[PDB]
Design a protein around this ligand. Sequence first.
Ligand SMILES: [Cl-]
Ligand SMILES: [Cl-]
Lengths: 226, 227, 4, 4
Amino acid sequence: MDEQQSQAVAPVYVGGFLARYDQSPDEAELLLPRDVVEHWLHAQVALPLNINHDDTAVVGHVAAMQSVRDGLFCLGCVTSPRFLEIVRRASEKSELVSRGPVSPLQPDKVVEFLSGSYAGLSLSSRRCDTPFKHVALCSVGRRRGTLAVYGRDPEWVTQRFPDLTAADRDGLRAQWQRCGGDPFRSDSYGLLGNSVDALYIRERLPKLRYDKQLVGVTERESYVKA
Amino acid sequence: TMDEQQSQAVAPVYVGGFLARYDQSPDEAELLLPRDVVEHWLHAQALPLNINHDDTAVVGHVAAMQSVRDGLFCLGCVTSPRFLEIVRRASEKSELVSRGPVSPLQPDKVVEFLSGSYAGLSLSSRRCDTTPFKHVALCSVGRRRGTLAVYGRDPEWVTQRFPDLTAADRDGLRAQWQRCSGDPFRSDSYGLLGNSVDALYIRERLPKLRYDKQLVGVTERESYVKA
Amino acid sequence: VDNA
Amino acid sequence: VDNA
Ligand SMILES: [Cl-]
Ligand SMILES: [Cl-]
């Protein structure tokens, strides 16, 4: 069925915190307080969404950014057909993906592959020694609490985070509704190459679980594999 | 010459390591594989070499198997041109590979990519509840400890990475890989990419790899191992 | 068969 | 620039 294949390659939304205000980074260069964030937000057209900071691996854009009680939260959208097609194909060959999602979620290979491979978000911003450059999907972010949550519906993804308020969501909904050619310039070999790098990030899983617990996506049902 | 360097990169790659360590008690009974059994099976029963047990991902063959003081040791050879070409291409896009190898080793992108992605060996054999040994698989980490995979361009060099092996041990292996059809690989980059996310969720992957490294003493040697 |  |  080319019908199912078209559904799999449809856009995919991603949301999560780019930074958590109550978390002390293990590196000074990572400090990003609320005041700065809010100032920068007021100043600085949509930011590109890429794979692990590789500008030749842009897969979409950031649809909304919002500073909330607990940190800087963002919602992006993976729209690159080339990237989605590659993911579709790979998902067909993942045993993890084959086992499917939990409780009552319907399987979604593409979404699941993305959840597993790029479980984290990593912001690219000006050093503190257009402030926001881009957001990257990665195996794990350097800032804690940056768990990436994938889903087909923006509302649904935002609803995965218990910290967010209805007001919070309205601010986000306003943005991704306003904002609402393939920019990807890499390929499967590129992603494959990037994969071995992810395999050597120390304490990847422990950090992911920690992020899951911190942002409460643990107390919700989602496609997260960590 | 690019075509020259590219041909050198896609040349065969040898892999060696223990399929099982006799002094290690498996965390699962189904993994028990004592010396007596191994030696008996060896006397009875080339085995294909594949990626994580996927028979559509055969990349070479096992050139030698030998039971030694510490366990069952094997030496294989990645010969699939299709697989090697894919690896070559991916290696060009790995930051880990870009950082290169240690001390005085010359960089070898293909070998390094293989060392990082498939740092372990996993035997496929008949249950213990003729041909007892089915195949050997290159994987992110093996279920049996001490199954660290060591890649290199020369079979002698690879066997020389394991301090436990004796000259006699090597002669027995050398005899085999010296005595020993078309590209058998039937997968592609998308397949390997799909397999990669699975590897990301094996718990305690690195800790196990380091443990294997220490057990087999490849730590006290210099190699392309990334763990 | 058992795969490791 | 700092990348996380
Ligand atoms: Cl990544
Ligand atoms: Cl594997």
